[PDB]
Every structure is written in C-alpha cells, then in structure tokens.
Design an enzyme around this catalytic site. Sequence first.
Site, PDB file in Angstrom:
ATOM      1  N   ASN A  71      17.841  -3.354 -14.610  1.00 38.33           N
ATOM      2  CA  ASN A  71      18.098  -2.071 -15.229  1.00 38.33           C
ATOM      3  C   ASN A  71      19.619  -1.930 -15.196  1.00 38.33           C
ATOM      4  O   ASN A  71      20.315  -2.880 -14.800  1.00 38.33           O
ATOM      5  CB  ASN A  71      17.400  -0.950 -14.463  1.00 38.33           C
ATOM      6  N   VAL A 120       0.860  -1.172   0.000  1.00 38.54           N
ATOM      7  CA  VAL A 120       0.000   0.000   0.000  1.00 38.54           C
ATOM      8  C   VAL A 120       0.903   1.231   0.000  1.00 38.54           C
ATOM      9  O   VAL A 120       1.634   1.469   0.953  1.00 38.54           O
ATOM     10  CB  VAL A 120      -0.986   0.001   1.180  1.00 38.54           C
ATOM     11  N   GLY A 152       8.418   0.584 -15.574  1.00 43.17           N
ATOM     12  CA  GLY A 152       9.292  -0.587 -15.553  1.00 43.17           C
ATOM     13  C   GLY A 152       8.525  -1.887 -15.374  1.00 43.17           C
ATOM     14  O   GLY A 152       8.739  -2.870 -16.103  1.00 43.17           O
ATOM     15  N   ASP A 153       7.611  -1.889 -14.408  1.00 43.94           N
ATOM     16  CA  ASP A 153       6.845  -3.092 -14.100  1.00 43.94           C
ATOM     17  C   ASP A 153       5.876  -3.387 -15.211  1.00 43.94           C
ATOM     18  O   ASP A 153       5.611  -4.549 -15.521  1.00 43.94           O
ATOM     19  CB  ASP A 153       6.102  -2.938 -12.769  1.00 43.94           C
ATOM     20  N   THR A 208       5.623   5.950 -12.650  1.00 43.50           N
ATOM     21  CA  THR A 208       4.309   5.550 -13.117  1.00 43.50           C
ATOM     22  C   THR A 208       4.200   4.029 -13.282  1.00 43.50           C
ATOM     23  O   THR A 208       3.367   3.539 -14.051  1.00 43.50           O
ATOM     24  CB  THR A 208       4.054   6.208 -14.472  1.00 43.50           C
ATOM     25  N   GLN A 259      17.145   5.451 -22.918  1.00 43.77           N
ATOM     26  CA  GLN A 259      18.022   4.805 -23.900  1.00 43.77           C
ATOM     27  C   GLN A 259      17.451   3.505 -24.485  1.00 43.77           C
ATOM     28  O   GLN A 259      18.059   2.903 -25.370  1.00 43.77           O
ATOM     29  CB  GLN A 259      19.411   4.554 -23.298  1.00 43.77           C
ATOM     30  N   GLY A 265       3.600  -2.094  -5.034  1.00 43.04           N
ATOM     31  CA  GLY A 265       4.260  -3.390  -5.075  1.00 43.04           C
ATOM     32  C   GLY A 265       4.621  -3.797  -6.499  1.00 43.04           C
ATOM     33  O   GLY A 265       3.762  -3.837  -7.396  1.00 43.04           O
TER      34      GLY A 265
END
Lengths: 303, 303
Positions: A185, A12, A252-253, A249, A225, A40
């Site tokens: 990354n 949360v 990545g996930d 935002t 990149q 998460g």
Amino acid sequence: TNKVVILGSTNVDQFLTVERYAQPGETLHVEEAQKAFGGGKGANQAIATARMQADTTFITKIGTDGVADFILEDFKVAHIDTSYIIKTAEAKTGQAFITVNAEGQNTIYVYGGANMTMTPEDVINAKDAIINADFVVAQLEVPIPAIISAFEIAKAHGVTTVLNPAPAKALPNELLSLIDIIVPNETEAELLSGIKVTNEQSMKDNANYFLSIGIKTVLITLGKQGTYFATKNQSQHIEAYKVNAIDTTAAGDTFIGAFVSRLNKSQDNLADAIDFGNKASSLTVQKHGAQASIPLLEEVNQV
Amino acid sequence: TNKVVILGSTNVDQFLTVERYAQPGETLHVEEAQKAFGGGKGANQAIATARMQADTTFITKIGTDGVADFILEDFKVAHIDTSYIIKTAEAKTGQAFITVNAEGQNTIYVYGGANMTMTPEDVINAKDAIINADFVVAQLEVPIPAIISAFEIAKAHGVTTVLNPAPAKALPNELLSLIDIIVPNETEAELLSGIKVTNEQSMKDNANYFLSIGIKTVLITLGKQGTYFATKNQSQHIEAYKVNAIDTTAAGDTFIGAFVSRLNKSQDNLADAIDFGNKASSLTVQKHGAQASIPLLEEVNQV
C-alpha cells in the site's frame, strides 16, 4: 484457473465491541465478551483466492491448541488443500486482539504465535505444492527466512512470486531479489523505497525503485484512490469501486486473492486482473439489507 | 409446523448513507446514490415466519410499477405462497426513504402507496388462505378496515388472530374486539392503554386493560429489557438476548414471525415461543466477521 499457493498467517481474531475506548487507568463496562473470528492475512488471502476458484493450497503454521479448528473447517469448505498446514506446540496459534468502538475504529494488537515460528524447513517440507504452482503469494505475518526459502523454490522452477509486504517492515536483498510482483500500500511502498506516495510522479518514482532492484511488476494499492501499477513497459492508474478509508473487512487481502486468481501467467492482463481484484474487494464493504439477514430455522436452533 | 397467513405491507426501502445529516437549507455531498432493499413490516414478518418453516401465505398489495419484483423473488425462494398478492395501478408500491448517518441513526419517511389502498374486498378475495390457517398476523402498515375484515373471517372460523399494532395508532373497538393476541412495544402499549410502561406494575396494568377489552393474550416487547406477557392465568417477564436499543435490522418483525411459527394453537407454550422469538431476533444483530463476507466468484461476476 490458476494454481495458487499461499504462504502465510492464520490468526484467531478476538473482537471486543465497546462504546468508547477506555483510557489509561480507567475501568469501563462492556456488553459482551470477546467474539472469535477467523483472521490472518494468509488465511484471508487463501480463502479469497479459493472462493475465486483458483486451485488453492495454503501453507500456514498454527498451534496444537485447537483454537483455529473452526478456521480449518472453513478452509475445507472452500476446498483449500490443507495437506501442508503445520501444527506446533512451540507456540499458541497466532491471534489478534481488536477493540472496536461505537464509531467503528479498530485498535489492534497482533500476537505472532505459531505463524512466527515458521521455518525454511517447514517450507521445504511443502515444496511439492510450490513447484507445481503458477503463483505463490506471501505476506509478512510469517518470518522472512521462511518466505525467502519458498521464493527460492518458486523462482528456481519458473513459478511467479508475489509478495504483499504487509505489515510494513524492512526487507533484505536476499528477499527483494526473489520477488516478481510486489503489492504494497502507500505506507509500505514508502518504507521500502524511501519515497512518499503523493502525486502520480511519486508513484512512477516508487515503481522505478522496485524495477531497478529486479522486481518485474509493481502495484501500489491506494485505498479510495484506487490502484497504481507499473512494469518496464506499462504504467497505469486504475480507479477503485467501493472502498472504506480504513480496511476493516479484509478488503486488501480480498483484492490480492482475486488479483492473483485472475492474472494470466504471461501477465498480459494486469489491468483486467486489477479490475477484477477491485471488484471482489468492493463486495466486502457492501450492505446486504435487513430482510437478507432474517435467519433460517437451522441457524436459530443453534443459538 | 403452523399454517400462518400474514396480512401486511411490502415496502421498497431506499437507503442513503451520509456522514452527517444535512440541516435545513444546507447542501451536503454523498458518496453513493440510494440503494434499494426489501422492507415492509408485513414482508419482514412473512419472510421470518417462512424461514422458520411455517406454512406461509402473504396477503399484500403492491403497485404495477415492478419496483418490488426483486422482493417477490425473495418470497418465492422462501416458499411463501404468493397466490394472493395484489397489484394495483391505483398507487405506486409502498416505499420508505431512510437516511443513515455515520453513527447509524436511521431517519425514516414512509409512503403508504399500494399498501394503504388494500380494501376488505382485497381481503375477502383471499379468504381461502385465512380459513385454513392456524394464525393470521397483521400490522398497521395496511388499512384498519382491511385488517378488521381479515380478523372477522379468522375469528368466525376459529383461526387465532394476532395484531402487531405498529406503527402506533388509535384502534376502533370493531378491531380491538377481534384480536386474540396483541404484541405492542412499550410505546404502542401506552397509546392504546393510556398507561405508560415503566415498572412491572405498569405492565400488569397494561395487560389488564387489554384483557378487559377481550384480548386473551398480551405481549409487550421491551427492547433490551426483553418481553413481558400476560393471559388471565399467566404473567411473566422474560429476558432478551442480543438486542440493539433502536431496531434497525428488522429484529422486532423477526421476533413476531418466529414467535408465531413456534406458538402452539393451545397457546400452552407462550414462554417457550417467546424464547424462540427472542433467539431468532438476536441473530439479526449478530456480527459475522470479515472472512465470512469474502465473496464467491459468482457474486463478483455480477458486479
């Protein structure tokens, strides 16, 4: 459509928007209290893969405090199979405390909570989901021994394993040797390989490290990149779309969720899947416009 | 449910997001081109009242250039009756050119275009909509003689007139004397009354000016400070919810749309309607969270 099991965290996120960050010993004043949102890495990636219409099951461990009950509802709306979600009184639900300033800088603290109590037995308990999956995806907001146990099950039954090694931390060989696809990354790559990511040669050098330890497919996310990937046979650098310098935002996930939703088992479409992942990710930093957010009656009746 | 006719502007907003505003003679570099979004006080207010489920008809004038065709689709999705929308080759569709910086400052130029070619005859042409309405709402992104003609029709048939006198400009008595409800902001009030808005006494003084010239109901929007209203019988200052200092989310227009959707013909519920309007408006500056904006398959397939 892929069958995807996500193993990972549900948080949360508590957001406090300030104008300027206080400094040590200071007392500033803020306009609003904390607003709670779903977070998460595991929840993010699970909702992404599921919104991409992959057959999704999410193995996650929350507390018995009910603070993520609204997230569970979102899981259900997304048609994520929640049969294997674990609740424990051992710890409160995992949480992140995020202070945003006027500019948009995120300063974040992460409380592991229930996420970091997940054990191999929690995982074994959910083995049915893993065995029948095409991919299982994990991140490091859950404990390494839990991930090892899920990847042992997967690998033993021909299920492709994918590790997003975030947040960065050292991994034991017991885990490294179970990973089919690794997706760090630049920062995560260098902590694992010892080799900084700079020019394409360093990317080759990184890939070669991972390949040498048995990981068959390597992606290094490069932010603005774009994305680099390598197998024993391939080596490609692919350009990104719209991408913020700092991920704020769940981009990545979202890339990982979509990437995995699109990947063929044969992995013959790495570049296409990476393209699709980069698309999905760009939609997250995309502006919708004022008229678009003019509310409906239902939403106002709830205020 | 009220029957509401909006008379006003439709704009195509061109947004260019920079990091820092160039200065005279300078050449900076930007990451993206202009993105087009729906705009216009009239379009905003029309979509607001319609999303509040008022029976909505929108009288607006665009060009024959097709640049607002995507907006027309949004009108249709909102169930706005578009029977009376006018297209002209006399001018291109109205447009706004908005440069945003890293902070979020909007610098805006407005091109009147087709909006400012709307004539009384365009309006007379749409009289059926007006006659059967409970309210007609206008703003000043359309020409005054068009507004006068619509308000003459309304007033003659017992239809309540409401003018949002924005952007600020001087009005002739021919119009002032046709307005039942006026809704300026502090800046617009002072240009019309000659009296600055500061303490509650100045608000009383403003109201008294408007009442004296025949306007029966006065609201002064105060931004963060909320909303003031007055009739011959009432005088109240009502607190706002969440409100940005500078309106950048069509909050003002959303307040008006919702206000009018909620107002009883008898106007016996001014404060309740103003409350509801302030609710609707707050939802526009409301954060949704990262997971919420994780995209669906359909949306990515369109990228």
